[PDB]
RNA sequence: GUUUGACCUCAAACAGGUAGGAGUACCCGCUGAACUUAAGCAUAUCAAUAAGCGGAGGAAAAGAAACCAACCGGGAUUGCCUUAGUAACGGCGAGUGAAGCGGCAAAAGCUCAAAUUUGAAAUCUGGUACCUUCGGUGCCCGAGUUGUAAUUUGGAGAGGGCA
RNA sequence: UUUGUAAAGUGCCUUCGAAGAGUCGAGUUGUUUGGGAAUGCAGCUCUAAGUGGGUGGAAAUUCAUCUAAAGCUAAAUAUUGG
RNA sequence: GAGUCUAACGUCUAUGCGAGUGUUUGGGUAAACCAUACGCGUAAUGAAAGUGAGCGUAGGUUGGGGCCUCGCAAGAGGUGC
RNA sequence: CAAAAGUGAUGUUGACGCAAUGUGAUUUCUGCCCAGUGCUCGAAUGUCAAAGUGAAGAAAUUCAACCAAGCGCGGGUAAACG
RNA sequence: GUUGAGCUUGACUCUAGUUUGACAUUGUGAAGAGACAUAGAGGGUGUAGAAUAAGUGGGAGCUUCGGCGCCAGUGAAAUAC
């Protein structure tokens, strides 16, 4: 058989796109450890969209030269960031929606967006629109903390993370569905991946091993295990429960 | 001999001194790179027997080698075919890893020519050989008969052909029984 | 260093360096130190610490203790050879022939050893 | 088992009347085995009817069994003999045939009469397990006294041990070494692993305590 | 604080000389295959070479014993004639296939240590300071004589000085 | 000129000397068709002695023979752009 | 322009010279002449316990005789190379 | 998922999502099965790699050969195949 | 055609991959739980039989505090040491 489409992922022409055009998608910069009245903390400036996220963001000023020229500080968009209200940070910070501050300082059952989870990453969890995680691993969880990430599963965290308290801005992808597919293709150019899809049974067993038969059906198997090769591993990857 | 503070240690590296000392001197090399200098030698006893009647120009550099065997690409696409070469770490070859260390310093510092080397132990990262390099300008060395030839132009890249002890083993030199066919060069008898 | 086994004090370490114009003859160099030993031509051995590489100086606390002179550690090399009065900065030295200092030289050797 | 104290465990034991408790009679020395790791199965089961070169020794109360000139030779030695009718006469009751397993140790049975023995006299001779030697009608019974010393039983049967005698106080310690080593030799080298299977043996006198080697 | 120095690691600018490239064949080394044959057949075999890259020179390139003979005897490398399809290997199938001995040509031999641990009068060196123009002056790294011997151990074989 | 310096020959007196370890090769592989398979030869990793060690296609054993692990060297010869 | 200037084996033509002959590199009187290293159809055969066959020379069957060992020279086994 | 390895996409997206597969807005609904095979889950209990017998004297030396998993067995499950 | 390529299955040969275990590079104290070597140390039934019966063979324990296969008897098997 030929080269399967899932193998063409690591490199490719379809795997190139605009990188430096992207002004700064939503990490978090240096923002003051202290809050001895605060040093590096200020107001929100502009509201600008970075490509990659598919949601509005913002610019912020602190104590440092940030309106135009210095290209870095992008601030996490909560409803409704704009000119004339302050952000605060620090360790033992003031707990408000729109303030970036620790997980340790917030009590159990606070919703948080743009949150770290490994030992430092600037900003990982829930950067775009709609998204948020839920910190519920303090109190009888004594030393090592735990964000219970939104499905059901795990993640052990030491001290770990800062993040903005709240639910993030937007809400118009699940809350409001689209209309057509060329307007959906605006996703797959700010992200690098093939689009759309053709059926596995419709493709030849040559090009993808889910084909086979004059009366078309699945040739090999739909459930394939985790430890497998490239063309071998397709379909539902380890169907733990069917149905 | 009297130098059983180098010799006793160099032959028996298993001793209490060098399994401690070469642990902290391989640690020293985990910081350092392709080439790096050494002061007066680590084993100056074998260094003098090779050729280290000193002067500046007579330097010594510790150099790394490679990992794997004789590496080639991995089988992408097919795996079978005619399986003449299947493995990624397949064959070895004639030359020792002395030569590998010697030409990495040899073509970087082109002016400084290769004499001969010895091993100074290793870690799990690479093997390390200390290459003694000479200088072709350096006199006293040119006034010595022992190092006259090495300075004059024919004895540039002694490793690349077969003049250095390691490059002798690329042709056919050890004195013994089947030295009759493999007397001169390997291509003179033509691989027999 | 890992060289120094038993040690002397710093104030008397200086007084060991200038053990050349107060005895008579002195040889210099760490070869001539290990050379010194059998027939007891070396009396005081002046072990410097600061000698590169350290493989040279690890002879001196061992070899010179087997066949056996009472050595003593000088403070450093930089004012060892200078206080002998040679050319260069001597890596070690030994006191060979004694002048008047035998009784004084006895408390250069036997303080450490 | 060692070849070290093979003389010594005979010598000191049989020497004193402190270890062994010497009675009225001449204490008859044996050597039993100690065959650990042996399975009473097919393979490891030894049996036979061999003999040791200086003779194992036992005699005591001897019975003869024969007709005709066997009876004449028997009582010319001084040992009494059963005939065919007298063989039945022990068997027809309880006590006398079980008492034939007791104190009557050595046995002779003549040619035609040997094959009569294991039909009547047999189930009573289970433990203890005495049986006559191969004696014909032409053999001399006085010269067969040393043959009933010599030919001893070898049976593993139920257990692991094979008890055979080595001598007595009639022998010296020297002779008894070349009886002890002979016993072990028969069992050991036929079944591999050998001397790690053969455990801790002591030479029993009669009344002779532990002196294992 | 503060006063005075040696080796490891290990720089940048002015200013005599010195050099680039165009080319063929011959050789050594390295990443290093294959069309093919046993009518085919994955491991015999095209083969350590092509092709590509590196290295040395005017010849390249080799070599003076950790050798053969076989108790009779001899003594480097290299080329040629005898040799050898012998002695072995491979579905013992294609195929591949030495050594020793005699003769001919042209045949001379040497650099390193009681290892090394190495330091000064002087010899004497790589780098480098002052003088500031290759001439004069100075220090450290250092090579053996030498100032002067050991270390770890041993023998009756044999060497060295002086003229 | 005996060259105020370097070597040899000749002649005399007096007296006693050595060794190069990542190599020898090794658990295992291999540059070698590993087959009982020398040698050439050292990937991953470690690793040996100078009256002692090594070559000679199995080993115990015996006889003849050589002394590495640093280094150099003329010709018989190969070949062309002009 | 379509069976051929390589080159091995085997009958045979011609043939200096033959029971010993004929070489080669090369020398050199130079296509001559001299030298004679050395060849010339070439070893049976026993799963594991030797001999070396006259260019190479064996097989089948049998008599005589030399040598060694064990044991009671009762007799057994090779020597038949 | 690419690459010999360094180094990256996936991705300054993050489950309110990323992707492989099944699929198709609308509107009323959805009965039944553990033999056979895959994926997943579980521990009562069965198997698989490190002995030692033999040669120095007219018949009396020495050293190289059994323990784990998947499996068996037991438990979960049919938008994985049936 | 003892044809070529694309291209296939739990046939079979084999490999990148995948998965589990072991060793070197690579140091240092307590508490709890095993194995070997064993100084030492023990867990049992069919009836009759004085009485609480697995062996094995030599063949003989009736007392300086104290028996029941000597003798004599019971039993499927019958002392001691």
Q: Per this entry, what is the length of chain C?
A: 113
B–C: how many Cβ contacts below 8 A? 18
Both tokens of B184, joined, read: 């001169």
Q: Which nucleotide across the nucleic acid strands is nearest to B121, CA versus C1'? A: F22
Return the DSSP state at B134. E
Strand I nucleotides, any atom under 7 Å to a protein CB: 6-10, 14-19, 24-27, 55-61, 69-71, 73-75, 77-81
> CA–C1' distance D152–H54 (Å)?
30
Instruction: Tell me how far CA of residue A29 lies from CA of A41, A62, A133, C112, in angstroms.
Output: 11, 11, 20, 61
Contact residues, chain C, for B39 at CB < 8 Å: 52-53
C-alpha dihedral sign at A6, A11, A12, A14: positive
> C-alpha distances in angstroms, D136 versus D79, D132, D133, D152, D201?
17, 11, 10, 18, 37
User: CA of C54: which chain B residue's CA is closest?
Assistant: B42
Polymer length of chain D: 213
Q: What's the Cα-to-Cα distance from D39 to each of B182, D36, D45, D46, D159, rounded to whole Å?
A: 65, 8, 8, 11, 9
Per-residue DSSP letter, D195: G
Distance CA C17, CA C10 (A): 11
Say whether residue B13 is in contact with chain C using an 8 A CB cutoff.
no
Q: Which residues contact B114 (CB under 8 A, 6 or more apart)?
A: B102, B103, B105, B106, B131, B133, B157, B158, B159, B164
d(CA B26, nearest CA chain C) in Å: 16
Closest CA to D204 of D9, D8, D1, D58: D9
Q: Is C112 on the interface with B (CB under 8 A)?
A: no
Nearest-nucleotide field for D155 (CA, C1'): I56
Q: Which residue of B has its CA nearest to C61?
A: B5
Backbone angles phi, psi at A225, to 5 degrees: -75, 180
Q: Alpha-carbon distance C37 to C71, whole Å?
A: 11
Query: Which of C3, C55, C64, C66 is the mutation pick for testing B, counting most B CBs within 10 A?
Result: C55
Tokens at B138, concatenated: 């350096």
* C-alpha triplet A162, A165, A171: angle, nearest 5°: 120
Contact assessment for residue A88 and residue A132, using Cβ atoms and an 8 Å cutoff: no
Radius of gyration of chain A (CA): 22
Tokens 């004193």 — which residue?
D16
**Cross-sheet strand order for the sheet of B35-38:** B35-38, B59-64, B127-134, B113-122
Distance in angstroms, CA of C2 to C1' of I31? 36
Backbone phi and psi for residue A25, each to the nearest 5 degrees, phi listed first: -85, 170
Instruction: Judge contact between B130 and B43, C-beta under 8 A.
Output: yes
Contacts of B178 (CB under 8 A, 6+ apart): none
User: Chains meeting B at 3+ CB pairs closer than 8 A?
Assistant: C
3-class secondary structure, D118: helix
CB within 8 Å: C53 and B6: no
B65 backbone dihedrals φ, ψ, rounded to 5°: -125, -160
Query: What is the DSSP pairing of strand D47-48 with strand D154-155?
Result: antiparallel
Q: What are the tokens at C97?
A: 């022939």
Cα distance between residue C61 and residue C9, in whole Å: 17
- What the block records as the tokens of A217 is 């059906």
3-state SS class at B64: strand
Resolution (in Å) of the shown entry?
8.9
| Distance, CA of B104 to CA of B130 (rounded, Å) | 12
Angle of CA points C61, C65, C69, to nearest 5°: 110
Q: CA-to-CA distance for D33 and D25, rounded, in angstroms?
A: 25
B74 touches strand H (CB under 7 A): yes
Strands in A133-135's sheet, in edge-to-edge order, are A100-102, A162-165, A110-113, A133-135, A145-148, A156-157
CB count in 10 Å sphere of residue A234: 19
Strand locations in chain B (E): 35-38, 59-64, 113-122, 127-134
Please choose, from the candidates A233, A199, A192, A222, the residue with its C-alpha nearest in 3D space to the C-alpha of residue A6: A233
Chain B residues with CB under 8 Å of C34 CB are 2
The verdict on a CB contact (< 8 Å) between C58 and B5 is: yes
- Tell me which residue of C73, C76, C57 sits closest to C109, measured CA to CA: C73
Burial D181-197 (b: 16+ CB within 10 A, else e): ebbbebbbeeeeeeeeb
Rounded, the Å distance between the CA of B57 and C1' of F13 is 48
Q: Token pair 């191969």 is at which residue?
A: D134
Take residue A91 and report the two structure tokens written for it. 């360790």
Q: Name which of B2, B4, B5 to mutate to probe chain C: the one with the most chain C Cβ atoms within 10 A of its Cβ.
A: B5
Which residues 169-208 on D are within 7 A of strand I at the CB atom?
204, 206-207
- Cross-strand bridge partners of residue C102: none
Chains near D with 3+ CB pairs less than 8 A apart are none
Asked if B24 has any chain C CB less than 8 Å from its own CB, the reply is no
d(CA A187, CA A175): 17
**Alpha carbon distance, N-terminus to C-terminus of chain A:** 32
SS (H, E, C) A33-97: CCCCCCCCCCEECCCCEECCCCEECCEECCCCCCCCCCCCCECCCCCCCCCCCECCCCCCCCCCE
CB of D60 under 7 A from strand I? yes
Helix (H, G, I), strand (E, B) or coil at D48: strand
- Phi, psi at B163, each rounded to 5°: -125, -45
Method: cryo-EM
* Chain C residues within 8 A of B2 when measuring between CB atoms: 34, 63
CB–CB of B42 and C63 under 8 A? no
Question: Which nucleotide is at minimal CA–C1' distance from C38?
Answer: E150
C67, C41 in Cβ contact below 8 A?
no
Q: Indicate yes or no: CB of C59 within 8 angstroms of CB of B5.
A: yes
State whether the Cα torsion A176-A181-A183-A189 is positive or negative: positive
With CA atoms as reference, report the closest residue to C53 among D142, A154, B38, A189. B38
Q: Which residues contact A65 (CB under 8 A, 6 or more apart)?
A: none
Q: Compute φ and ψ for B96, nearest 5 degrees.
A: -80, 165
Query: Beta carbon of A160 within 7 Å of strand H?
Result: no
Copy the structure tokens of residue D187.
């069992």
Residue C54 approaches strand E within 7 Å at CB: no
DSSP class of C14: H
Q: Is the CB of residue C38 less than 8 Å from the CB of residue C67?
A: yes
With H, G, I as helix, E, B as strand and everything else as coil, classify residue D31. Answer: strand
Burial class (CB in 10 A: 0-12, 13-18, 19+), D132: buried
CB-nearest to B2 from C34, C53, C55 is C34
Asked whether residue B192, judged by its CB, lies under 7 Å from any atom of the DNA or RNA strand H, the reply is no
3-state secondary structure chain A: CCCCCCCCCCCCCCCCCCCCCCCCCCCCCCCCCCCCCCCCCCEECCCCEECCCCEECCEECCCCCCCCCCCCCECCCCCCCCCCCECCCCCCCCCCECCEEECCCCCCCEEEECECCCCCCCCCECCCCCCCEEECCCCCCCCCEEEECCCCCCCEECCCCEEEECCCCCCCCCCCCCCCCCCCCCCCCCCCCCCCCCCCCCCCCCCCCCCCCCCCCCCCCCEECCCCCCCCCCCEECCCCCC
State the greatest distance between any 2 C-alpha atoms of chain C, in Å, as a whole number: 36
Sign of CA dihedral A230, A231, A232, A238: positive
> D165 beta carbon < 7 A from strand I?
yes
Q: Which nucleotides of strand E lie within 7 A of protein CB?
A: 5-10, 27-35, 42-43, 47-49, 54-57, 60-68, 77-79, 97-100, 111-121, 124-127, 139-144, 147-152
> Cβ contacts (< 8 Å) between C53 and chain B: which residues?
39-42, 44
CB D71 within 8 A of CB D115: no
Helix (H, G, I), strand (E, B) or coil at B129: strand
Q: Does C36 touch chain B (CB under 8 A)?
A: no
Does C3 reach chain B within 8 Å, measured CB to CB? no
Apex CA A215: angle with CA A212 and CA A218, to 5°? 40
Residue D33 near residue D195, CB atoms below 8 Å: no
In whole angstroms, G24 C1' to B170 CA is: 39
Does C62 contact B at CB distance below 8 Å? Answer: yes
SS3 (DSSP) at D108: strand
Contact B42 C59 (CB under 8 A): no
């Amino acid at each position: 058989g030929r080269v399967i489409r899932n193998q063409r992922k690591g490199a490719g022409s379809i795997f190139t796109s605009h990188t430096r055009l992207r002004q700064g998608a939503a990490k978090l910069r240096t923002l003051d450890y202290a809050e001895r009245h605060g040093y590096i903390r200020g107001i929100v400036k502009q509201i600008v969209h970075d490509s990659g996220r598919g949601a509005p963001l913002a610019k912020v000023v602190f104590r440092d030269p940030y309106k135009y020229r210095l290209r870095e500080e992008i601030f996490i968009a909560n409803e409704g960031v704009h000119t004339g209200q302050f952000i605060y940070a620090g360790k033992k910070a003031s707990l408000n929606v729109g303030n970036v501050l620790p997980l340790g300082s917030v009590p159990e059952g606070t919703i948080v967006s743009n949150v770290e989870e490994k030992p430092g990453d600037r900003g990982a969890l829930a950067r775009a629109s709609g998204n948020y995680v839920i910190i519920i691993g303090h109190n009888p969880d004594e030393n090592k903390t735990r964000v219970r990430l939104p499905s059901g599963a795990k993640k052990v965290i030491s001290s770990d993370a800062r993040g903005v308290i709240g639910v993030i801005a937007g809400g118009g992808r699940v809350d409001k569905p689209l209309l057509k597919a060329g307007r959906a293709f605006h996703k797959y150019r700010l992200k690098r991946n093939s689009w759309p899809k053709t059926r596995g049974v419709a493709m030849n067993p040559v090009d993808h091993p889910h084909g086979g038969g004059n009366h078309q059906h699945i040739g090999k198997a739909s459930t394939i295990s985790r430890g497998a090769v490239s063309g071998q591993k397709a379909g539902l990857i380890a169907a733990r429960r069917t149905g | 001999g009297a130098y059983k503070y180098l010799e006793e240690l160099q032959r028996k590296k298993q001793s209490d001194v060098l399994r401690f000392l070469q642990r902290v001197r391989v640690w020293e090399y985990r910081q350092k790179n392709v080439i790096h200098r050494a002061a007066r030698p680590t084993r100056p006893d074998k260094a003098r027997r090779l050729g280290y009647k000193a002067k500046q120009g007579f330097v010594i550099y510790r150099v790394r080698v490679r990992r794997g065997n004789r590496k080639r690409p991995v089988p992408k696409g097919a795996t079978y075919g005619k399986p003449t070469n299947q493995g990624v770490n397949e064959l070895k070859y004639q030359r020792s890893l002395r030569a590998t260390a010697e030409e990495r310093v040899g073509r970087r510092a082109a002016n400084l020519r290769v004499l001969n080397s010895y091993w100074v132990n290793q870690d799990s990262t690479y093997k390390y050989f200390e290459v003694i390099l000479v200088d072709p300008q350096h006199k006293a060395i040119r006034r010595d008969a022992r190092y006259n030839w090495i300075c004059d132009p024919v004895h540039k890249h002694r490793e690349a052909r077969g003049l250095t002890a390691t490059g002798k083993k690329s042709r056919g030199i050890n004195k013994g029984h089947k030295f009759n066919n493999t007397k001169a060069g390997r291509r003179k008898t033509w691989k027999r | 260093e890992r060289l120094t086994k038993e040690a002397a004090a710093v104030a008397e370490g200086k007084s060991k360096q200038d053990a050349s114009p107060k005895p008579y003859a002195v040889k210099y160099g760490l070869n001539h130190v290990v050379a010194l030993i059998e027939n007891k031509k070396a009396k005081l051995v002046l072990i410097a610490n600061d000698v590169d590489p350290i493989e040279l100086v690890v002879f001196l606390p061992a070899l010179c203790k087997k066949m056996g002179v009472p050595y003593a550690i000088v403070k450093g090399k930089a004012r060892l050879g200078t206080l002998v009065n040679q050319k260069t900065s001597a890596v070690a030295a030994l006191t060979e022939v004694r002048a008047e200092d035998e009784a004084a030289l006895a408390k250069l050797v036997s303080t450490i050893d | 088992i060692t070849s070290s104290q093979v003389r010594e465990h005979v010598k000191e034991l049989l020497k004193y009347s402190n270890e062994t408790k010497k009675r009225n009679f001449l204490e008859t020395v044996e050597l039993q085995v100690g065959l650990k790791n042996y399975d009473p199965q097919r393979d490891k089961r030894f049996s036979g009817s061999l003999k040791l070169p200086n003779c194992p020794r036992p005699n005591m109360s001897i019975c003869i069994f024969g007709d005709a000139f066997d009876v004449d030779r028997a009582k010319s030695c001084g040992v009494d003999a059963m005939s065919v009718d007298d063989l039945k006469k022990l068997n027809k009751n309880k006590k006398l045939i079980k008492k034939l397993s007791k104190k009557y140790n050595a046995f002779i049975a003549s040619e035609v009469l040997i094959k009569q023995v294991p039909r009547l006299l047999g189930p009573q001779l289970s433990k203890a397990g005495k049986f006559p030697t191969p004696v014909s009608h032409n053999d001399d019974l006085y010269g067969k006294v040393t043959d009933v010393r010599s030919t001893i039983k070898f049976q593993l049967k139920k257990v692991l041990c094979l008890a055979v005698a080595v001598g007595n106080v009639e022998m010296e310690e020297d002779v008894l070494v070349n009886q002890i080593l002979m016993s072990v030799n028969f069992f050991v080298s036929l079944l591999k692993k050998n001397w790690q299977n053969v455990g801790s043996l002591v030479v029993k006198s009669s009344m002779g305590p532990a002196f294992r080697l």
